[PDB]
Design a protein around this nucleic acid. Structure first.
Ligand SMILES: [Mg+2]
Ligand SMILES: [Mg+2]
Ligand SMILES: [Zn+2]
Ligand SMILES: [Zn+2]
Ligand SMILES: [Zn+2]
Ligand SMILES: [Zn+2]
Lengths: 162, 162
DNA sequence: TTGACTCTCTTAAGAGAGTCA
DNA sequence: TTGACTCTCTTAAGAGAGTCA
């Protein structure tokens, strides 16, 4: 809600609730042939999810609180960043999973960045493979690699140059 | 169905027409601080676009040929790949701009791969900066870099560990 | 047969809001 | 007030198909 105090109270209640979500250990590629360990705090697969939480899509949730007799609702991963600018360079800020684990609500696994920055982490080589993200990746992106290209650049005639 | 000879004739007509598009020289980052040059064959901004071409969206076009009284139509960048498999690993193949220049129809700037592989090239460090794409990038992706993250991982209390 | 428009859809990273009990 | 559902929307890489002359 409006006041900084009210916002801090929302963040604190969210952290307390998410802090009781099951902690699931995931071993992850870091790049450079190395492996690390992340501890994700995973929202349950089915109701009940936790005080204030409800599922609005297959892997979408919202956090809800009643302040001054009014319901306030946010995307479930946006709550850590309620005191941050909601845009950057004219682009909407989004909650971005450094652990690439949607059900996870560990704020130590989230950052707040444009949708382009968010998406791009899927292909990052990782913190031990050359990540250049200023807010560093926690793991190599799940889609990093050579790809599976079916056909490369080609011409039948002689009209084109690279 | 069109014979493989009829399909080759469509690719040849397409190449003939695209080869007469304005050719624009672009200097581009290759990664590793090196600069290179790409020559894009750019479809016009407004009608007429060229024989067989029409705009179906702000940056979407289609190619159309009528053969034995049947109208055939294809996405304008898909024509080089009409003799290739159209899916891989259960994923639809898409035309993927190695030059990241949507108006370009140079087939030496296109490859044929899943939408995930396609998107991922936006963040590639480039052929002189560590590209691992098996079909190699022609340039550093336009979105490669440190990013512009507004807020990083953080907690107010002590409920979480990484 | 052709040109120049029109419309909606896919994907996978993300969102907002309403209906009931 | 709180819970458990319902619906559609955004973005930027990509698509298929209809109408009229
Ligand atoms: Mg993400
Ligand atoms: Mg692309
Ligand atoms: Zn996590
Ligand atoms: Zn990274
Ligand atoms: Zn090009
Ligand atoms: Zn590459």
């Amino acid at each position: 809600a409006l006041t900084n105090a009210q916002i801090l109270a929302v963040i604190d209640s969210w952290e307390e609730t998410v802090g009781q979500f099951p902690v699931i250990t995931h071993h992850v590629p870091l790049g450079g042939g190395l492996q690390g360990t992340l501890h994700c705090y995973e929202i349950p697969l089915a109701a009940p999810y936790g005080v204030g939480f409800a599922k609005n899509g297959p892997t979408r949730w919202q956090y809800k609180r009643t302040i001054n007799q009014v319901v306030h609702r946010w995307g479930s991963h946006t709550v850590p960043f309620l005191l941050e600018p909601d845009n950057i360079n004219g682009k909407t800020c989004t909650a971005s999973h450094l652990c690439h684990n949607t059900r996870c609500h560990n704020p130590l696994h989230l950052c707040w960045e444009s949708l382009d920055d968010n998406k791009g982490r899927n292909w990052c080589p990782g913190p031990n493979g050359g990540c250049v993200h200023a807010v560093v990746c926690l793991r190599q992106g799940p889609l990093y690699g050579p790809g599976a290209t079916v056909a490369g650049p080609q011409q039948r005639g002689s009209h084109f140059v690279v």
